[PDB]
Design a protein around this ligand. Structure first.
Ligand SMILES: CCCCCCCCCCCCO[C@@H]1O[C@H](CO)[C@@H](O[C@H]2O[C@H](CO)[C@@H](O)[C@H](O)[C@H]2O)[C@H](O)[C@H]1O
Ligand SMILES: CCCCCCCCCCCCO[C@@H]1O[C@H](CO)[C@@H](O[C@H]2O[C@H](CO)[C@@H](O)[C@H](O)[C@H]2O)[C@H](O)[C@H]1O
Ligand SMILES: CCCCCCCCCCCCO[C@@H]1O[C@H](CO)[C@@H](O[C@H]2O[C@H](CO)[C@@H](O)[C@H](O)[C@H]2O)[C@H](O)[C@H]1O
Ligand SMILES: CCCCCCCCCO[C@@H]1O[C@H](CO)[C@@H](O[C@H]2O[C@H](CO)[C@@H](O)[C@H](O)[C@H]2O)[C@H](O)[C@H]1O
Ligand SMILES: CCCCCCCCCO[C@@H]1O[C@H](CO)[C@@H](O[C@H]2O[C@H](CO)[C@@H](O)[C@H](O)[C@H]2O)[C@H](O)[C@H]1O
Ligand SMILES: CCCCCCCCCO[C@@H]1O[C@H](CO)[C@@H](O[C@H]2O[C@H](CO)[C@@H](O)[C@H](O)[C@H]2O)[C@H](O)[C@H]1O
Ligand SMILES: [N+]
Ligand SMILES: [N+]
Ligand SMILES: [N+]
Ligand SMILES: [N+]
Ligand SMILES: [N+]
Ligand SMILES: [N+]
Lengths: 405, 405, 405
């Protein structure tokens, strides 16, 4: 009876998890599409490799730090190596564990596209290990450490922080880590001219980026729907809202991009779609389809503004607009929780939207400070023992080097 | 008890819907594969864009026209913007809504491949909006307007019209709209020679079209299985029949194409596979696996004959054979309902196959007259304010223009 | 109650089956990626065609031979054409049938990559028909003929042979058939030099092989999870173990390949990942996640050693390392059942690991003798009436010939 509902809940969570695994393929296509053709091999391989690393690091330590027994709402201290997962009374056990593993893989893979084309291999693999072992799961404990282990909470959740599926926990966290990495690696050699103007580099396979967007969008259905952690009538609502945020983000982008540039530029249209997906991840279980449309519209435009600001004003070179999609998109969705969520979902102690907005903002700032700041430190310390970039000669020839024999 | 079965039914419908969403990627690959390499960008982008448009138009008006409260079995008059979806006693609510949205996206995206390579952007996006707002959901009301809202029916269904998953409602409707659009746009510039002979243009990425076929076939599992709208033992039957129709269609094609052309031509083999899929969509819940095999065999050959007739006798230039796959394939499947369906499924008032055949034929003719005729009018009226084709220079250079900076 | 659990069990098995269908696309991408660009068309088409053939042959005879009423634990003798499937009391009927069909398609498609680039069409299609009609389903009866039809068993299962999801039944069987075919076709013309050294041929689309690996890995979730044939809490365990075997196989490979070749070679990294997947298929329901990690680590390295042995010592030319992934990987996983499986799962009559190891080894040797030996005979007899290879001129020009008009 209850045992049959538990079985259905396993089925859905594990199916959703598999859909989220398939986002790993999404990111691989998207990033390869956005890349210069001479680097397509390296970027395909980094994306496969990071999935290997993230799985093992999250199995060994990440899950425990994130969801194990809480030390002061700060960090988890058991469930390393999935120790005694099956003894926990939390009904979803391995299904929950795998679901959260593929979340961690999502957070970590954001990196590769932000430092593509000129970073070396070691910064990628070591970056992956670091985000998955430290940055991601400790923030995750703060935000979500109430979810698995009995009778505990993370300090941010205790204050009333809301992030349904990880706009901040996955996407902003990964995006700010990527942003530090992009800064410390530096721009691609021919990105900026001596007058400060920006060149368009890459996007040599628009069809492949398009296929990437579809895979990502499909996967986000599991990302969002699976985050219910159970099957109810609500499942159709969450997925419909996810779809509507993506679609509205795209349409707002088509309009804004035509009006302001007199053509449809593929790069910015994708950015906007994916940013809307990221944004709706914060709130898709607690908003109406019309609010999902509004969140998409607002996120689509703001993400494109951000993408241009990052590129041309901050002069951070982000070949896939990862910082705009995941970092900024997650901030926007996370803040929108306060504006749009059904009032019964608010956790702010006084019950108000104003107060929830301040808690959401606090979560946003803490996520930035933790992930960008530790990421800066991590890449500063790495740079001291291994150069972060490849040589300029390698950069012009292409990272696809070894397959020439 | 019943509440647990309702939960399982949501789970399946929403999973199926997500599989059908992934057909959008299928069509993108298939069409890009069938295209000339110089146009691959435009076709990838049109396919993504139409998904944005179809989602929002169907959310706003299409669903209401199709499934809302019936005015005389002719058109629905509420459930615009999903108004009060949750209050309906129809148990599937949002899940049903999203399922039917991705059906609408399927119907609309058929267009792009039929007018690829020489139509301009506006005819595509405006065509999408028109099919999704008017043609598709009003015919859908006629055929399926009994399905969601309590105690009503569409006039065609009232006469006993059967289409399980949309051989006519999705595929023929979309295919006849595409056929009007292909006619009004006209053929590609170098398609036909001065002696009337046909050139083979495009299909520059057979591997990508192959991947497209697999995605489509996979998605059709959800398209058909999900149309049960509930989980039963019948789910394996529907999917097995879908598979067997595709496989038989392909084998019949391999045989017929070898016998008549002394080589395996990839284009026609794909046409046949997809046409068999389209055909089995009418009846996969009501036939045996052996009848699914017969439907596939018959559809495979007839679709290839049709594809050649359309191309070389009607001189309609259809770069992906959309009219043959979706238009003709849907007619064949829809007629086969009368021939092959289990007698308990027939709705013809007198209970007979002859009479069901006449009702199926009537549905077929009405679908044609409505979708081809309104499509002709729509593109005639559009042409009066915006030329439907690009300039010949643009056509020879390739629609992939803006990505050259 | 029990009827609702039966419905959930259908849902999962059919979903898993659809995921396994999508492996067909996986193999198509993987093999196309590993191929020389001039042959990509032929390999895409062979992979689509084999899915057509395997479906129909397995529907007609394979399923009956494999799962029908047992004649002496040797071969099944009913359920041809799915005759009376619905009357069987085995609760999963069509769902089970389709699940096992896509297993058969997996076994058969292994062939194409092993003889790619220089075999002709007929050896491929006839090979497919033969493996699906004879080799696969008769061995399948021996190993699994207890599973569907009431009160019977296959002789190997009777001795206590264990293969959860088909490390031997699918993968080794298909891999040894492929190995015979590769031998009888002979090596690609420029594979080996006059001094016996090996050239690297192909792998012209590493990104596409990467996408192939992800699809395969995703599909293996269904392959393994679906093999529970029911939904329980165990579903998360099986999928988590599948993931962990792949990830460990990849990491072990990164380490071993760096240490021994001072670079990451993409081909061997993929080989190892897929071999780990194959291996964990034998035991994913009966091992802990840490043992899945050990199985992956061991399989990853041994598969790479094997791949080199096959190529450079046996001088069998296997363009996708199918023999190493599927043949050797399946042997390793099948033997590991005895080493790692939870003791309650062992079937060896005396209850011991030593004894189970001897039964697993016996299954391994019988699978080899049957599939390699009949495959040798089959291709010897075929060669007598149709040459197995294309002409050297065709081989240098590329099998992609007919699409040039
Ligand atoms: C769970 C954790 C275990 C996983 C362990 C996996 C083992 C990994 C094998 C090591 C592979 C090293 O791979 C190698 O790294 C270095 C450092 O970035 C890269 O080097 C690159 O950056 C350096 C620094 O400016 C350049 O000088 C060099 O010319 C350039 O190629 C190599 O291009 C890359 O080939
Ligand atoms: C829910 C609905 C809201 C969605 C609104 C989306 C906003 C859309 C932005 C408008 C984009 C217009 O895009 C533009 O259209 C025109 C008209 O077909 C195309 O124009 C093409 O056809 C014309 C007509 O012969 C040719 O003269 C022209 O040389 C050729 O390029 C452009 O090639 C295309 O770039
Ligand atoms: C359920 C079962 C029913 C399925 C039936 C399907 C019908 C199949 C149509 C037959 C197609 C034959 O396809 C054809 O086969 C032959 C034999 O390998 C190939 O021939 C190849 O090998 C031969 C033998 O050395 C070479 O001489 C030839 O030059 C080379 O091209 C052709 O390249 C291929 O085009
Ligand atoms: C929160 C903190 C976010 C801000 C982080 C700073 C980002 O990186 C920083 O580093 C960038 C390197 O290219 C920029 O430096 C220059 O690099 C160009 C040549 O590549 C040239 O065109 C610029 O005008 C020159 O100033 C920039 O000076 C700075 O903006
Ligand atoms: C139901 C109604 C279906 C029929 C619709 C008619 C289809 O379109 C119609 O338009 C077509 C334009 O190419 C054809 O016109 C010609 O275009 C070729 C040069 O491109 C040349 O080779 C032909 O011989 C010449 O007649 C055709 O004359 C007609 O068949
Ligand atoms: C269990 C049974 C497994 C073993 C099966 C035997 C495999 O095939 C067999 O056939 C192979 C053809 O290339 C090999 O023959 C040669 O082919 C090369 C030129 O292409 C040359 O470099 C070699 O040195 C020459 O001997 C090999 O002599 C043999 O190993
Ligand atoms: N990844
Ligand atoms: N990535
Ligand atoms: N689309
Ligand atoms: N399309
Ligand atoms: N296949
Ligand atoms: N294959």
């Amino acid at each position: 009876m209850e045992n049959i509902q538990i079985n259905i809940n396993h089925l859905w969570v594990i199916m959703a998890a598999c859909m989220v695994f398939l986002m790993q393929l999404g990111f691989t296509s998207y990033e390869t599409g956005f890349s210069q053709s001479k680097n397509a091999i390296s970027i395909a391989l980094r994306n496969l490799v990071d999935t290997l690393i993230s799985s093992l690091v999250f199995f060994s330590v990440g899950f425990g730090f994130m969801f194990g027994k809480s030390y002061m709402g700060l960090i988890g201290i058991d469930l390393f190596f999935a120790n005694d997962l099956a003894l926990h009374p939390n009904t979803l056990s391995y299904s929950f564990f795998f679901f959260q593993m593929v979340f961690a893989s999502t957070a970590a893979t954001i990196l590769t596209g932000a430092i593509a084309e000129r970073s070396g291999f070691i910064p990628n693999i070591a970056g992956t290990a670091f985000i998955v072992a430290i940055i991601y799961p400790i923030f995750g404990h703060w935000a979500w450490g109430n979810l698995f282990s009995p009778d505990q909470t993370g300090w941010l959740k205790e204050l009333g922080f809301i992030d349904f599926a990880g706009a901040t926990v996955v996407h902003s966290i990964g995006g700010w880590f990527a942003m530090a990495a992009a800064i410390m690696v530096g721009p691609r050699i021919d990105k900026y001219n001596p007058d400060g103007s920006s060149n368009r580099i890459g996007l040599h396979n628009v069809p492949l980026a398009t296929l990437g967007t579809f895979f990502l969008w499909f996967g986000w259905f599991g990302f969002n729907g699976g985050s219910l952690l159970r099957v109810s009538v609500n499942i159709g609502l969450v997925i419909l809202n996810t779809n509507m945020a993506a679609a509205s983000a795209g349409v707002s982008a088509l309009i804004f991009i035509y009006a302001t540039r007199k053509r449809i530029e593929a790069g910015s249209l994708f950015t906007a779609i994916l940013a809307g997906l990221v944004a709706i991840t914060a709130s898709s279980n607690m908003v109406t389809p019309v609010s999902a449309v509004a969140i998409g519209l607002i996120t689509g435009i703001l993400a494109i503004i951000a993408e241009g600001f990052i590129e041309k004003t901050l002069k951070i070179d982000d070949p896939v607009s990862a910082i705009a999609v995941h970092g900024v998109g997650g901030v926007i969705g996370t803040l929108c929780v306060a504006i749009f969520a059904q009032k019964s979902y608010l956790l702010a102690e006084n019950g108000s939207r104003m107060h929830q907005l301040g808690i959401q903002a606090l979560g946003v700032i803490v996520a930035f400070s933790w992930s960008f700041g530790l990421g800066m430190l991590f890449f500063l310390c790495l740079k001291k023992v291994k150069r972060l970039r490849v040589t300029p000669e390698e950069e012009k020839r292409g990272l696809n080097v070894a397959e020439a024999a």
